[PDB]
Design a protein around this ligand. Sequence first.
Ligand SMILES: *[C@@H]1O[C@H](CO[C@@H]2O[C@@H](C)[C@@H](O)[C@@H](O)[C@@H]2O)[C@@H](O[C@@H]2O[C@H](CO)[C@@H](O[C@@H]3O[C@H](CO)[C@@H](O)[C@H](O)[C@@H]3O)[C@H](O)[C@H]2NC(C)=O)[C@H](O)[C@H]1NC(C)=O
Ligand SMILES: CC(=O)N[C@@H](CC(=O)O)C(=O)N[C@@H](Cc1ccccc1)P(=O)(O)C[C@@H](C)C(=O)N[C@@H](C)C(N)=O
Ligand SMILES: *[C@@H]1O[C@H](CO)[C@@H](O[C@@H]2O[C@H](CO)[C@@H](O)[C@H](O)[C@H]2NC(C)=O)[C@H](O)[C@H]1NC(C)=O
Ligand SMILES: *[C@@H]1O[C@H](CO[C@@H]2O[C@@H](C)[C@@H](O)[C@@H](O)[C@@H]2O)[C@@H](O)[C@H](O)[C@H]1NC(C)=O
Ligand SMILES: [Cl-]
Ligand SMILES: [Zn+2]
Length: 607
Amino acid sequence: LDPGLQPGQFSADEAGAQLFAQSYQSSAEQVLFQSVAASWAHDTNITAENARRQEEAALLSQEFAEAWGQKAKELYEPIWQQFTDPQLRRIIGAVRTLGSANLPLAKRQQYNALLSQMSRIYSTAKVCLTATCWSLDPDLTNILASSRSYAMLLFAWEGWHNAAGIPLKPLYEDFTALSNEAYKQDGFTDTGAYWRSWYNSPTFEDDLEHLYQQLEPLYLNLHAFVRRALHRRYGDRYINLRGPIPAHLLGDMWAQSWENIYDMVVPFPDKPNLDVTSTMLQQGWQATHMFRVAEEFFTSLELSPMPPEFWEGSMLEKPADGREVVCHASAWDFYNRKDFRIKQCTRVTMDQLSTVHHEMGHIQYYLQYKDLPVSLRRGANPGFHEAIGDVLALSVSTPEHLHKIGLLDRVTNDTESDINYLLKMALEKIAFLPFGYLVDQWRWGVFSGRTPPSRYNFDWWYLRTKYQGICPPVTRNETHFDAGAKFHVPNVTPYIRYFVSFVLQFQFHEALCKEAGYEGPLHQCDIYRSTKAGAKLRKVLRAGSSRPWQEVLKDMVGLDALDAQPLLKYFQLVTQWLQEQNQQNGEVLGWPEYQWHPPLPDNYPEG
Ligand SMILES: *[C@@H]1O[C@H](CO[C@@H]2O[C@@H](C)[C@@H](O)[C@@H](O)[C@@H]2O)[C@@H](O[C@@H]2O[C@H](CO)[C@@H](O[C@@H]3O[C@H](CO)[C@@H](O)[C@H](O)[C@@H]3O)[C@H](O)[C@H]2NC(C)=O)[C@H](O)[C@H]1NC(C)=O
Ligand SMILES: CC(=O)N[C@@H](CC(=O)O)C(=O)N[C@@H](Cc1ccccc1)P(=O)(O)C[C@@H](C)C(=O)N[C@@H](C)C(N)=O
Ligand SMILES: *[C@@H]1O[C@H](CO)[C@@H](O[C@@H]2O[C@H](CO)[C@@H](O)[C@H](O)[C@H]2NC(C)=O)[C@H](O)[C@H]1NC(C)=O
Ligand SMILES: *[C@@H]1O[C@H](CO[C@@H]2O[C@@H](C)[C@@H](O)[C@@H](O)[C@@H]2O)[C@@H](O)[C@H](O)[C@H]1NC(C)=O
Ligand SMILES: [Cl-]
Ligand SMILES: [Zn+2]
């Protein structure tokens, strides 16, 4: 570690701790910058040389974390918990937590190598037909979205899960052991306990379960309605009206968003088509247009435009040359107050327009808290960061807003159109909830040891069936590692943030709509051009993590806790309508035939 990045001396009291924290944050910026820069260089250009460079950067970050962490423990370990300043307790409390820097050098290198190899495997995995091979994005993504052939969807689904999952399993087992070893030295029972601690709620898991109980009936009714719609097209052989839905038929590789099957489930087709994708294609929208349109919404609220450095630095399409990249969308803060970038393999699609807003929400957060000390440059909690762009996309997707940006003919304000819209939104928001909840339940079980390598897939599919009411379309066994075929698993990034964000975004939307002076139904609100809504949002963004999330939320929303009521209020009309329809159709809610799996196609797997 460079002499300039090593800690000096400070007194072993609160006053010295304040000076320690100030000096720590000054040095940390340079270390963060080199770390991010090397990660950017690899993720936008996957090579062996770029991977080695990223691994060296990770080692340097560990050296830094070790030096300052040991210093913090030397001076403050027995006293930091009694410090009067709560912001100071949070920062020193973080610095005393070494993580992977707790590992001996050999194991540090092993840990970094594993992360690199898992990332490489996930992003370079392909499905081969003789010589031509399909990638996840765009090839397999397009197939799951637009193919309605049971056999083709199966080939894509099985191909991907096999190609990504199988080689990942041995690496994931080793990562889990090393990660646990690291965090146990910091006093956590396991890595899952550390991840959960970010929410600073002693009742976090029970709070989540209470939230889910209120939401589950909405999912069960959506599920039943959708299952019936699928049965009408795939037939009694491939769809069991009392069983789980085959996992490959919902428009998405992980069945986590069902928006792609909207045309099959739309109750009133004679009304204007709310899926704006075909209109975007006809008009000739490109990635550039999508990002500029997203930017203009942010500026309409008097938030910050994207800086020159963003436009010059970002990767907004999958590169046309012979470059392999990480295609999963991401937003990047370089911690230099100047460089902020998005890397997205943008496709011309309505849901991708929502994803553009999502990523720009992360950037906007970075732009707003860039002048804070580096440790405060995060969301109030991870759920906040994930909610920002989604809140704005709720306004963008309204038929009225779509009309304003030229993507829809003036829509009527009638009950049929409302049901169509809310159903579309339910496919995107309600359908996701069970998946958002289950992923880290699986992962927490793995970190805790409740789920050993011998039950990885057994426990994955237990949760997928329990929550989502889906089943694998082909037989799986413990050689398969289907959890690993989801980006966030091999990329070691937590998932509960997304469940939190999907609830939180409706709380934000309600608060911002009220501030904007809007007086109608919540699902018809559009905050576009509301400088008052803008100012309220900006206060949250400029706060960073300087204050407990409960207090930030109280100031914005009037409540100091996550609450499902705004989501329920938003969806109320379609919730009632789906209940009524399922009752009339004589549906069974749930999947009592839990053991049911669909048969294989006759000519499996050829075609
Ligand atoms: C779509 O239409 C709804 C409903 O419109 C109402 O019902 C129809 C069947 C017709 O009778 C319409 O003539 C009638 O307006 C609209 O929602 C309604 O918006 C109005 C105006 O924003 C709301 O009135 C306000 O109510 C608050 C208290 O809640 C008062 O403080 C205000 O002074 C003001 O009177 C009204 O509450 C609301 N109605 C319902 C049932 O929610 C909606 O505006 C419209 N949407 C679009 C995009 O055009
Ligand atoms: C970790 C980081 O540098 N930026 C985060 C945003 C932030 O916390 O500042 C990010 O880009 N995070 C992205 C996911 C990611 C996480 C870690 C590495 C690479 C990608 P995202 O949440 O914006 C991508 C988003 C499309 C996503 O994954 N959504 C969920 C619902 C999903 N499964 O599709
Ligand atoms: C992808 O990364 C490689 C390095 O892994 C880059 O190749 C280097 O390019 C610079 C300048 O063009 C040369 O000085 C090096 O000799 C190259 N290294 C190797 C190992 O070939 C490459 O430029 C990157 N690709 C893109 C499009 O940025
Ligand atoms: C796990 O399953 C692997 C491949 O899947 C199997 O083969 C196909 C063609 C079908 O018959 C399907 O029903 C089977 O699941 C096997 O190669 C492998 O032996 C299995 N792993 C273990 C440990 O038994
Ligand atoms: Cl999280
Ligand atoms: Zn995100």
